[model samples]
Target: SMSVKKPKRDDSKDLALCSMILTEMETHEDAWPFLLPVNLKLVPGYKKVIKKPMDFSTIREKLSSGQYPNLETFALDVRLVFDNCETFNEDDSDIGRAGHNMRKYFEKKWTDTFK
Candidate 1:
């Protein structure tokens, strides 16, 4: 006996689109700060502050491992990366500015491609 409900829509399209978005974002100039996880040794209180830490590489790993059940879940992780950056860095600072830039770029692509 199983109580799990299945998704009726096709998810393969979402995965393909998300993969393209990830590759394009990895090449974006503002991607440097988000290429990997925030270094624990270099940053203070990051673990405590960011409840759910997310980054490009982590998202890629999740995507590769089929961790996302839907596009909404995938987008949530992408948004988390920027939200954490804003919480930890100043808006005018280099890293903060890059985070904003990346968020803007991502939002545009999301709308243009998905909306």
Candidate 2:
């Protein structure tokens, strides 16, 4: 006899996890507020449309299924942000320290969670 079980589709759980991670990221005192604000402005609809409760599941599903046709769009926006960072008129010390701290936090999170 053969048996079949349905695949799990609990993307809300994944979205909640991602939100928690983002929340934790913002709690760090040394994070670059300017970068976050600029990034958020560049992705204006993401917070209101995509990051809300109802859309997360669909977003997660599409991302996990490799169905994001707009990936390049986001990549281009990120690249532009990186290119314009030096033009933001922020003090070099603050930028350097914040970037270092953010990188360390990301490295720790990636190693612990994704590795």
Candidate 3:
């Protein structure tokens, strides 16, 4: 058989970028809630809602293992963290505020890095 679907672009750049962003995200003060997965024990109904729960540590592992096929996929996982956050927390709540802040920071860094 020939090649697969989409053209296989070299992922070195994307990998480095994702790693850098993930490191920054992990260190961000607002990253507390997102450092790890949601504890199903404490946060009930989490599994019922966030089907694809993404977190900083998970993203790091995914990046290190070359799980993302493209930069878009990487971006999706990164955005997923905040998306899940907003779905579970209130806009004005502590976790909610952190999510928004983290999301904004992620977007800014994404734009700056890509632009």
Candidate 4:
């Protein structure tokens, strides 16, 4: 019934952060081979516990749905995704750039809101 779907302008920054890694992968298709499941190894299958979104819209859905209790938790979840994935683990690597940037974004949001 509403023209607006769920994206609030306030969430734009975080949404963009959340989507960056995926967007980077799509744009930098060269990283896919390393981002695959096997290469994205989780510690003791942590994947079962954390479900990080790979797109802006998905992040909006999770944010509006209260997927995280606080921005810190959300930030941790994103960090986990980046930390575990081979292609996203290093900051200097082109493929890891988005995740690193997103990590900083969430941390900034956390400080802005929690402090």
* Candidate 1, pairs of clashing residues: none
> Between the candidate structures 1 and 3, which one is better when assessed by lDDT?
1
lDDT of 3 by residue, 43-80 (tens): 88998888999898888888889788888899999999
Question: Which parts of model 1 are misplaced by more than 4 Å?
Answer: 1-10
lDDT of 1 by residue, 2-93 (tens): 98777676665899999999999999988999999888877889988888889999999999998999899999999999999999999999
Instruction: After the best TM-score superposition of candidate 3, give how far the Cα of residue 13 lies from its true spot, in angstroms.
Output: 1.9
Clashing pairs in 2: none
TM-score, model 4 to reference: 0.39
User: Can you write out model 4's per-residue Cα lDDT over 1-115, one digit (the tens) per residue?
Assistant: 4785865446436644544543443344343423434322644543564354243334345656768654555556545555655432456676567556555655565565445
Q: lDDT, candidate 3, residue 105?
A: 96
**Which model, 1 or 2, shows the larger lDDT?**
1
Best by TM-score: 1
Single out the weakest 10-residue window by summed lDDT for candidate 3. Answer: 1-10
What tens-digit string does per-residue lDDT give for candidate 2 at 1-115?
2587788554444434444544555566754442244344675444554332212233344445655444333223333333344334244767645655555664576456434
State which candidate, 2 or 4, has the greater lDDT. 4
Q: How many clashes in each structure? A: 0, 0, 0, 0
Report lDDT (Cα) of residue 27, candidate 3: 95
Indicate the residue-level lDDT of 10 in model 3: 65
Per-model lDDT: 0.93, 0.45, 0.89, 0.49
Q: For residue 6, give model 3's deviation from the true position in Å.
A: 13
RMSD of each: 3.3, 10.3, 3.3, 9.9
